[PDB]
């Protein structure tokens, strides 16, 4: 299937956290690594988005509405896909993974436990890269932004991605006539986790103790 191929090929290249050796194992250290990784990640993501079949056909506004409505679901999806092979650990980056003890010391015991909830489901399903990249696009198109100008357009963006998921699924997983649906039914958990995080790193924004870059802010406040 064309859309699924195009989407594999468009996946942006890996990225490293590069924690700093000048600081000791501190929470404010960690939280800044993530808010750093996340910012560099967001620029990578805005580039990716332009290559999703049709997303460019939208308006700069619609595009921004979708992206600033779904960007955190897309960051979490990446973390989730990377951790599929790991146990109770969260591959935030290749050179920066976590585990209970670690994440619990960074004040994210609950948030990352939810993200490991996603992992478990996808693990149990045996999520594929074909499915992952299509789900990620479907979650940006199905962002539920309340400011979209052209709604008929955005609903077509969703239908091509949706039809792509369904084909792929019917061709590759004919033994589970309900596989595409099961993939779709995990988006509610994603939406939930996604806003739990955005609301959380918004406290850590306001408080003022952690340093954040320009994009990760403009997004974490819209």
């Amino acid at each position: 299937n064309k859309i699924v191929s195009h989407l594999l090929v468009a996946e942006p290249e890996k990225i490293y956290a590069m924690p700093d050796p000048t600081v000791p194992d501190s929470d404010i250290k960690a939280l800044t690594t993530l808010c750093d990784l996340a910012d560099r990640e967001l620029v990578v993501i805005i580039g990716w988005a332009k290559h999703i079949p049709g997303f460019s056909t939208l308006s700069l506004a619609d595009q921004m509405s979708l992206l600033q409505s779904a960007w955190m679901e897309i960051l979490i999806l990446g973390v989730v896909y990377r951790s599929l092979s790991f146990e109770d650990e969260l591959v935030y980056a290749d050179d920066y993974i976590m585990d209970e003890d670690q994440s619990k010391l960074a004040g994210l015991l609950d948030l990352n436990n939810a993200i490991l909830q996603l992992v478990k489901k996808y693990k149990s399903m045996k999520l594929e890269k074909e499915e992952f990249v299509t789900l990620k696009a479907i979650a940006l198109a199905n962002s539920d932004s309340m400011h979209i100008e052209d709604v008929e357009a955005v609903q077509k963006l969703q239908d091509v991605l949706h039809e792509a998921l369904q084909d792929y699924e019917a061709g590759q997983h004919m033994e589970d006539p309900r596989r595409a649906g099961k993939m779709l039914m995990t988006l509610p958990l994603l939406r939930q986790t996604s806003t739990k995080a955005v609301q959380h790193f918004y406290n850590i924004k306001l408080e003022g103790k952690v340093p954040m870059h320009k994009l990760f802010l403009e997004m974490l406040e819209a």
């Binding site: 595009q63 600033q68 994009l215 403009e218």
Partner: peptide, 11 residues
């Protein structure tokens, strides 16, 4: 809403 408007304007 400014940074993201630039990156998007690239294409």
């Amino acid at each position: 809403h400014k940074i993201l408007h630039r990156l998007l304007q690239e294409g």
